[PDB]
Design an enzyme around this catalytic site. Sequence first.
Site, PDB file in Angstrom:
ATOM      1  N   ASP A  59       2.904  -7.078   5.222  1.00  0.00           N
ATOM      2  CA  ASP A  59       4.123  -7.872   5.172  1.00  0.00           C
ATOM      3  C   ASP A  59       4.504  -8.079   3.705  1.00  0.00           C
ATOM      4  O   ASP A  59       3.824  -7.573   2.809  1.00  0.00           O
ATOM      5  CB  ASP A  59       3.940  -9.207   5.901  1.00  0.00           C
ATOM      6  CG  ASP A  59       3.159 -10.219   5.089  1.00  0.00           C
ATOM      7  OD1 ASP A  59       2.016  -9.910   4.690  1.00  0.00           O
ATOM      8  OD2 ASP A  59       3.687 -11.324   4.852  1.00  0.00           O
ATOM      9  N   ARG A 110       5.570 -11.356   2.271  1.00  0.00           N
ATOM     10  CA  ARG A 110       5.690 -12.770   1.921  1.00  0.00           C
ATOM     11  C   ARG A 110       4.514 -13.226   1.068  1.00  0.00           C
ATOM     12  O   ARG A 110       3.359 -13.009   1.434  1.00  0.00           O
ATOM     13  CB  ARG A 110       5.765 -13.630   3.181  1.00  0.00           C
ATOM     14  CG  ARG A 110       5.907 -15.119   2.899  1.00  0.00           C
ATOM     15  CD  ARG A 110       5.901 -15.940   4.176  1.00  0.00           C
ATOM     16  NE  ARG A 110       7.212 -15.970   4.825  1.00  0.00           N
ATOM     17  CZ  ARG A 110       7.488 -16.652   5.935  1.00  0.00           C
ATOM     18  NH1 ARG A 110       6.550 -17.374   6.542  1.00  0.00           N
ATOM     19  NH2 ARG A 110       8.712 -16.614   6.444  1.00  0.00           N
ATOM     20  N   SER A 153       2.779 -15.351   6.889  1.00  0.00           N
ATOM     21  CA  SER A 153       3.314 -13.999   6.823  1.00  0.00           C
ATOM     22  C   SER A 153       4.786 -13.999   7.197  1.00  0.00           C
ATOM     23  O   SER A 153       5.240 -14.844   7.977  1.00  0.00           O
ATOM     24  CB  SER A 153       2.543 -13.094   7.776  1.00  0.00           C
ATOM     25  OG  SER A 153       1.163 -13.113   7.468  1.00  0.00           O
ATOM     26  N   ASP A 169       2.479 -15.798  12.508  1.00  0.00           N
ATOM     27  CA  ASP A 169       1.762 -16.436  11.399  1.00  0.00           C
ATOM     28  C   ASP A 169       2.749 -16.956  10.358  1.00  0.00           C
ATOM     29  O   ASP A 169       3.609 -16.212   9.876  1.00  0.00           O
ATOM     30  CB  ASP A 169       0.777 -15.455  10.755  1.00  0.00           C
ATOM     31  CG  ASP A 169       0.097 -16.027   9.525  1.00  0.00           C
ATOM     32  OD1 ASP A 169      -0.287 -17.215   9.546  1.00  0.00           O
ATOM     33  OD2 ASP A 169      -0.058 -15.282   8.534  1.00  0.00           O
ATOM     34  N   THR A 196      -0.418 -13.877   4.734  1.00  0.00           N
ATOM     35  CA  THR A 196      -0.479 -12.395   4.549  1.00  0.00           C
ATOM     36  C   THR A 196      -1.007 -11.704   5.804  1.00  0.00           C
ATOM     37  O   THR A 196      -1.931 -12.192   6.454  1.00  0.00           O
ATOM     38  CB  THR A 196      -1.369 -12.012   3.344  1.00  0.00           C
ATOM     39  OG1 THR A 196      -0.786 -12.510   2.135  1.00  0.00           O
ATOM     40  CG2 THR A 196      -1.526 -10.500   3.226  1.00  0.00           C
ATOM     41  N   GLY A 248      -5.469 -12.680   0.016  1.00  0.00           N
ATOM     42  CA  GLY A 248      -6.234 -13.665  -0.743  1.00  0.00           C
ATOM     43  C   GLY A 248      -5.487 -14.050  -2.003  1.00  0.00           C
ATOM     44  O   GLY A 248      -4.264 -14.215  -1.982  1.00  0.00           O
ATOM     45  N   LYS A 257       2.501  -5.695  -1.510  1.00  0.00           N
ATOM     46  CA  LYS A 257       1.071  -5.879  -1.281  1.00  0.00           C
ATOM     47  C   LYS A 257       0.308  -4.569  -1.174  1.00  0.00           C
ATOM     48  O   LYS A 257      -0.923  -4.568  -1.177  1.00  0.00           O
ATOM     49  CB  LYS A 257       0.861  -6.694  -0.016  1.00  0.00           C
ATOM     50  CG  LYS A 257       1.396  -8.098  -0.160  1.00  0.00           C
ATOM     51  CD  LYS A 257       1.174  -8.906   1.097  1.00  0.00           C
ATOM     52  CE  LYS A 257       1.977 -10.190   1.034  1.00  0.00           C
ATOM     53  NZ  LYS A 257       1.536 -11.147   2.074  1.00  0.00           N
ATOM     54  N   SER A 296      -4.205 -14.094   6.763  1.00  0.00           N
ATOM     55  CA  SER A 296      -3.971 -15.219   7.669  1.00  0.00           C
ATOM     56  C   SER A 296      -3.401 -14.764   9.013  1.00  0.00           C
ATOM     57  O   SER A 296      -3.624 -15.411  10.035  1.00  0.00           O
ATOM     58  CB  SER A 296      -3.029 -16.242   7.027  1.00  0.00           C
ATOM     59  OG  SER A 296      -1.839 -15.626   6.561  1.00  0.00           O
TER      60      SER A 296
HETATM   61 MG    MG Z   1      10.376 -20.196   7.525  1.00  0.00          MG
END
Ligand code: MG
EC number: 3.4.25.1
Lengths: 125, 222, 196, 196, 204, 211, 233, 226, 195, 195
Positions: free
Chosen positions: H17, H19, H169, H166, H1, H47, H33, H129
């Site tokens: 993001d 994901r 994400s 990341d 995230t 989290g 989110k 992250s």
């Molecule tokens: Mg991938």
Amino acid sequence: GYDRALSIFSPDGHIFQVEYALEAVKRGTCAVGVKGKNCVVLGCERRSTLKLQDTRITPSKVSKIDSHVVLSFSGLNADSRILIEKARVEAQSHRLTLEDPVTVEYLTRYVAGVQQRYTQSGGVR
Amino acid sequence: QFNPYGDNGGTILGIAGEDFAVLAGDTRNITDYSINSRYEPKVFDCGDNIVMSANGFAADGDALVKRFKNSVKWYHFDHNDKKLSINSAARNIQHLLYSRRFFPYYVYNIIAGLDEDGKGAVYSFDPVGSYQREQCRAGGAAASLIMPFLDNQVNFKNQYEPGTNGKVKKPLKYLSVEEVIKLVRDSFTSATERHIQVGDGLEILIVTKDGVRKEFYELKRD
Amino acid sequence: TSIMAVTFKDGVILGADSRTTTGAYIANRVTDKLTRVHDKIWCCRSGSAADTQAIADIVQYHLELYTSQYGTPSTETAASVFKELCYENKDNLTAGIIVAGYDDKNKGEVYTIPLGGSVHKLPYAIAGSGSTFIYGYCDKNFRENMSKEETVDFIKHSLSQAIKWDGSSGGVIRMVVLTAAGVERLIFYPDEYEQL
Amino acid sequence: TSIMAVTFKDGVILGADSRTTTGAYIANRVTDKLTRVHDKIWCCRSGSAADTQAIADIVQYHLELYTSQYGTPSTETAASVFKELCYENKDNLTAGIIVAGYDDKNKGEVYTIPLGGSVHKLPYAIAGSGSTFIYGYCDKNFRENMSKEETVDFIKHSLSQAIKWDGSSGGVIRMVVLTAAGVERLIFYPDEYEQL
Amino acid sequence: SDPSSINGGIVVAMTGKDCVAIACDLRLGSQSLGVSNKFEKIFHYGHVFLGITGLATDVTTLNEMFRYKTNLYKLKEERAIEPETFTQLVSSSLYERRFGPYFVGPVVAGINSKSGKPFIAGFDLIGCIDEAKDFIVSGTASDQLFGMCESLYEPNLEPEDLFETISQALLNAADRDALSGWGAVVYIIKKDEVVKRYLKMRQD
Amino acid sequence: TTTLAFKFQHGVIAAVDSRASAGSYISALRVNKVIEINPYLLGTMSGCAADCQYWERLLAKECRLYYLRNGERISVSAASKLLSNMMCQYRGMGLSMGSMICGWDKKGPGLYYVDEHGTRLSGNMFSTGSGNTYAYGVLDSNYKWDLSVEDALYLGKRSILAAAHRDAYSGGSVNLYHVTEDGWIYHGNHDVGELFWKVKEEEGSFNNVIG
Amino acid sequence: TQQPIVTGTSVISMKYDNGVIIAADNLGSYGSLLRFNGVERLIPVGDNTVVGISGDISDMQHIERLLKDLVTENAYDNPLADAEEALEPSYIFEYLATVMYQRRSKMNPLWNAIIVAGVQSNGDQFLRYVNLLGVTYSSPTLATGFGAHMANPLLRKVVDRESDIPKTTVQVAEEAIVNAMRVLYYRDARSSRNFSLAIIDKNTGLTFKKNLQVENMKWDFAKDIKGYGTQKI
Amino acid sequence: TTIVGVKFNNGVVIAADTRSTQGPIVADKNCAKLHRISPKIWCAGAGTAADTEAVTQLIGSNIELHSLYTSREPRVVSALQMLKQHLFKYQGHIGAYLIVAGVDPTGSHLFSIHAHGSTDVGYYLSLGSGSLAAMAVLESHWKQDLTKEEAIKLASDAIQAGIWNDLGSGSNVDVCVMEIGKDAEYLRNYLTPNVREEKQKSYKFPRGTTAVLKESIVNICDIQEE
Amino acid sequence: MDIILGIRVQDSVILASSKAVTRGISVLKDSDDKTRQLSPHTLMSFAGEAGDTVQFAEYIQANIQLYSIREDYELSPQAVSSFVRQELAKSIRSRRPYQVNVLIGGYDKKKNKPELYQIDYLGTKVELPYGAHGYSGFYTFSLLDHHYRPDMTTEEGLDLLKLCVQELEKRMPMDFKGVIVKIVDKDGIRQVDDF
Amino acid sequence: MDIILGIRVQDSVILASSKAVTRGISVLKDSDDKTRQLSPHTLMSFAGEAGDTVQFAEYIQANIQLYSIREDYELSPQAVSSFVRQELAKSIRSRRPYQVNVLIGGYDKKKNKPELYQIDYLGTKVELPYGAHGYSGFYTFSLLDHHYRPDMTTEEGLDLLKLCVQELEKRMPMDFKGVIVKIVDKDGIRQVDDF
Ligand SMILES: [Mg+2]
Ligand SMILES: [Mg+2]
Ligand SMILES: [Mg+2]
Ligand SMILES: [Mg+2]
Ligand SMILES: [Mg+2]
Ligand SMILES: [Mg+2]
């Protein structure tokens, strides 16, 4: 909680609530018990003021407390269900803790104890 | 405490054709949630028409490949420049892996080439040395995502012929190199969508009697 | 433990407290942590007393043998021998050593060798459990090319504070002065340094 | 963290760095660790940011209610409320708090409340991970009844060294001055204090 | 030991053109031992379908719980619950056990009776909603199902084409999972007709 | 995994499943769990595939060297012993191996169970793996010495099927082998999926499963 | 098996059109104590290679000595030691990578993360990473420790793939590196303001810059930040 | 995230993001989110996803009731105070890491909240992250007195850094702009830089490929009349 | 108290339960009856942790007997099994769960069908033609999978059960001291006194 | 491989050893002979960890057979037992000890006496009239303490042994699949094929 002392002594030494409870019994339909040499018979009156009644499903006057003990009554019908339920629970509780079914005298003593308790507990009639 | 092992992610795929073989793998190298490289080659031409990929812990993978390439070199020296057959290479690799039975190369290895009859061949290894010849094998991170798809689209598993209702199976017709490459690309594109360690790029090595050819394709970089 | 070595104009001075503890018990209150490995190459010891004594004894042996063959060793050479022992046996040692020496060519030099076995040449060095409390004081009060008297005062004041705050440090403040003139030992008692 | 509170002639000054870390990552480089619990009663926070914020908020509530009933509370009273929370919940807290305030009757006062929940009234107090490196400097340089300018210099120099040696400390140096004149906020940037 | 993989099993749901599909395997086991090949994991409350994977006792408990709640909902609201509303109810009910959760992976599928819009949703064991347009997967072979669905799926499939897609996704995923299989069921759901088909598969 | 082997009138049958798992994930549908040591010796494999493959291929080397030196084929008893002694060298090291050494020599057909502990047991019937209990049930109730080669082959085949069905980590396909004095004979690879339905219909078994 | 004692944080690097750049701060930390402020963690090997090392400093000093010995040994019986048979970046890297993997295989690692930056004989840029596990990889940008998390994202905005390398000048590359070092100083608790930077160019050779400082920092906005929520004063 | 928050001239912007992951597997490629606490108070969560939702709904519910009780528009400091006291009480067991932003009669605000209950103030923040990738961008390009357009750009650029660098994400960028004296504008899928390419093959099966044992109609209707 | 088997044939349910009880390294009893009659046409066998098994069984028995008296009616085997399952599902998240696995063999007088329910200590309920708990199924299910028909007589069920016990006695390391066998059918519950 | 008993009567030594071998939860064999003939008049039974038992037993056998050939002479049971004890005492302080308990039943031809030696894996040797290893003695020794005489015949020894096995079969939780019984006397070693 509601703690009001409803069953109390009067100047002449009477508990009127207990005595008025007996008047409710006087109003109830007649019940009779006769024990022979090798049996007991329980007879019960059904007032014929109520016809169009479904006799299959209408609460019967005699109730099995266990497979070997029965209970009939006179008085308030709704009140009797509470005593019957308690008696039935106690019967199974006895079988579970002592590994013998209740004696008739023991079951009677229990039901009578419940009735007594409701004559000197607060907030109950 | 020192952990001598690590996980560099990556996913590889080997498919054996009728007269060819492919060994594909993504070019992404990772640790945890970080990307080390978007292009770090993982499938290698080891000579004698053999391709190889050791997926898992990159340090052990690089060491094993390096040793096998060396084993090929010495096979030539010791046996009058004889060509190392794919089955002989497979057996040799078993012994390279099992020399560390008590401190293994943390890699799942695949080699691809042609057998001595000119047919396509793929061999699959576990970290400790067990091996066997296969028609289709995905290895690494997203192996579990890809293999069921290949069972379905390469070996036609659970597929029956319309009208018969489960009485007659779909016949196992051979696939062309162009057909296999489509399944490879779709396998990796799908893996890239649902696996975070898969992405960046896809490198495919195709082996035929003419030699070894390479093909590269972009993948999503997220 | 509180130990330090400071270079100055005429050479170098080593300083140390004299307390050795086993838990909260002071096993020795008059310890000599200023150790001689050669005529004008000394060291300050911190960490395991067993380890630092064993190391210092081996170093003294190496430099004694070096001298018999190649003449007087440099302070850098001494620090290298210390480092070689401390680095190669880092798994089985707990030693924090400061090496200090005087050459005529190089003058006063100080090397610190912390736990890992690394070497660091410095103008001055502090070490031991009590050093933590005087990083600020020493950084603010150190000057290069101090006089002998200034350097003695700097070390005396510094270790005074280290002793004040660190329970593992205490006793007397010992000092060794390394110059062209020779080797001079100094000692300062509690009644002197506590009132600073 | 590096925090301190120092009494002087006209009152008291609180000082602090601005770095908050999660391991080696600096989660916030411009933190305000100087917290107001009453008009002229502030605190410096160290330890768990969650715990010290929760405590400070409860204290602020208690002193706000105290004021509505009994008028302006003393600095001692504020320290007692802090202590009561820190001592009774010592098992579930990690908080090192310095309480500083100005009365007209009592003038500048400083109380420190370390981990256990004990209270200690002092002329000045230092706390936080970086305080260890300036125990010697602060002890040597503190004087009673300093001027505002001297006290600002003392705190600036002290926290400068704490920041220099402690990785957990850094950023800007914030200060809050508590006097009869009122409440003054000060800030000092790296280019200023690093060259000291 | 891991409660979400003791009994095994899988569920997958897909959207199509004016339709949804939900399917599950029939296995129930005690780790390596296969116990039942008739353990259906899909239930329905009116026109809303719920698939539940994970620990079998919780699957059964939750079914009885949502039957309970949807029956009261209907008596009070005087109408059947919709998929969007039910999804929120599942989420609410799971999160109320945040620190003692049901070890399950629920999957909702249905068509809104008023808008006619197809709807699917998935949850983690504590209620986080995944409202995907395409497909939802759950169970011990969710990795396998993700791989199948991601490649086999295409939007706006007709009911009888969707059937083949979801069936092949389930079957081949289950055949790469030791703890799934032993039979399979597929529901094809349209606004006012639902067809249930039992699939033939390998019994190992 | 499920493997078995038993001795009977006309030799020894060897039957194995073909599954390999990595947790719940089925890594392989088709592994060869019988190792062709030589034309007269077989070895089944349970435990670590690497340990089974390596040490049994090394046993083949020893069995061939034996024949070259002595000019005579090695016995099943001696071959099984060479293998058990290799295991005892790495005793405690962590090898994992459970195999039946099957063959025909002078004393007739022979069958020895050998494991990583160094255990070596002679016997008429053995079964190893996560599904061995299921296989033993079918074997024990139907086994006779008086079995024909045809019926014996079916018995070993049916016993694996029983395990493949119930055991989650057993399945894929069944590999049959028949060991004679003239050498072993391979009796094919049999998909369990296809075999199950076939056996269900013909035999009437697995009534509880709907087909 | 050990644990690192005195440590060096991030080493960052990137390729540009005519060479490579590498940088690393001058700090030797002792846990949270910023103990040593004059540590050089970029070590040049000849005039074509710079090895940047993070992690354990005692192990760094050991590696430094290996490299110094390597140069001595290469010159032995070698008339072309300063010409055709001089050490290449690829030779130096492969040697280190061999050592690192051997040491981890004996369960006694050199607790480091190394980046070898240099320019080959044919003018090709060399940039490859190796660490205590013997893991190696190459990329247009490479960074260790915190630099991997904070520097790479910034440096990858300049050179996102191989084709961006010829389009990137030394001025743009150096600017990106210098900015990254500032960001690390803002956000890495084990970093220092002082750092070293080395440029290895195929035309202008090795340029080694010492005593650099992070400058142009933003701190003024801190004055407006008060409390942690509700506080106004 | 990856989630960020950026203050500007006349308001504040948050971004994130899309994901959601379960280990190394992507559960949802287009997750939401950005959560609404009140009309002009939004928060982004990293989290434990169920915790960020649940705690945002609960405080949003109580904020709404508070707004009705006091006849006033909700304040960000109220949401902040209610969130942190709830999270503190649960000692970090509710794994909600939030960036809270909004406008109210007092002005524009930006805060972060950690799962243990600690809060922070700032002009620019990042969580998750991919927070380090995002913060690198924010530290490189942030300045005082940003415009609305510059802030949206900076915010989305910071999320992109997380998306690309990341692994936790990915996918798309969501944005919400809260400006003083205006309606908050929620920009779902503001950027879409990760559309999947067309597949090489169609995997639509022939009808009758799957083997079937039984068919039956499922009665979803209620009990019928007559 | 480890071995309990059940088999549902044409017109009855048969439950077989081991007789052994072990305390430490000593077998205390070789005639223990691991079963309780819940109602005239419903029998429950049980296995698990010592003490919990009987306590749970008797608690269930008391509740079903209470229901029978209150309503003057025998609950269906399905209703009883659901009640039992809920009690175990309730129990698994209690402070100290009841570590008890049960088989419920009942004859439904309304439907005129035998019914066998298998419920483990987690509250995992399944209706089966034959069932077992613990490792019992590992040895016996291959025989039951092979020989079982739904139209088997009571006598054929007993013969198949004997084969299952013989296989247990051969391949199981533990001596469970044989089994007590009971039959549940339309006429009620009876014990096979020679097995 | 857990149960081994021994009894020394008037003119012979009798060794009884269980037949079971268990791998995991399955009994692999019910006819295993847990014994080796060391010399014509010396028999050794054994029990302990899998593998080690046979390996140790065969190693001892090879050494005694080697001695017999070298000297053209049979070692006394006492000499053999001492050799065996030393090997186990040697083994207990090795890197990986041999976890093997043995009974050595021999007939001394010089003294014309039967002899029974009990040696555990530590190298603890005792000469006894009757012995056992593991838990075997817990069940059997009270019977042996009661019934044993030193002037018993071989037939009486076998009858007392039957009673010991019957008690084991009653009170032991494990099924050890009966015992193989062997007799060692002046004429050598023979097996009782019906027991
Ligand atoms: Mg991938
Ligand atoms: Mg600092
Ligand atoms: Mg399966
Ligand atoms: Mg199976
Ligand atoms: Mg806390
Ligand atoms: Mg069950």
